[PDB]
Amino acid sequence: GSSGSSGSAKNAYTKLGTDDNAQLLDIRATADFRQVGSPNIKGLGKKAVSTVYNGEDKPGFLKKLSLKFKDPENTTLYILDKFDGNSELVAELVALNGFKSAYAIKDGAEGPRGWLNSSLPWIEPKKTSGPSSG
Numbered sequence: 001g002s003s004g005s006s007g008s009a010k011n012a013y014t015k016l017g018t019d020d021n022a023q024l025l026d027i028r029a030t031a032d033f034r035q036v037g038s039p040n041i042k043g044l045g046k047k048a049v050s051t052v053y054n055g056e057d058k059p060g061f062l063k064k065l066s067l068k069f070k071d072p073e074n075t076t077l078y079i080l081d082k083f084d085g086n087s088e089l090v091a092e093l094v095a096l097n098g099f100k101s102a103y104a105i106k107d108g109a110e111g112p113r114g115w116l117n118s119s120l121p122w123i124e125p126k127k128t129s130g131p132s133s134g
Contacts, residue, residue: 023048025078025094027051027087032082036116079104090104
């Protein structure tokens, strides 16, 4: 693909912990934190910033970021989509809108080698009983 963009699933999480300044922008839909869960990066230091991307309305999305990050000017963000979405698109928007340098993850969360399929930590919804139900 792009030798420089969307690395393997760990390629983000690794650099999430090792950078100590890095962050996560879960662009996955607000429903996906109901139906799949969220990534448990808390042991690196903090939770991810859930804000659904919509290629609709660039400013009406970035309104969530400006209050959420202390030092966007050197914080290394990592988007996280469900599969593909527009991860690599957001990965070149924030850095051009006053953050430093941004990244995506291939296969997102639910992809065949994405976050879930990478030994990476998760939060999930509540415990329930009915796998064929969803």
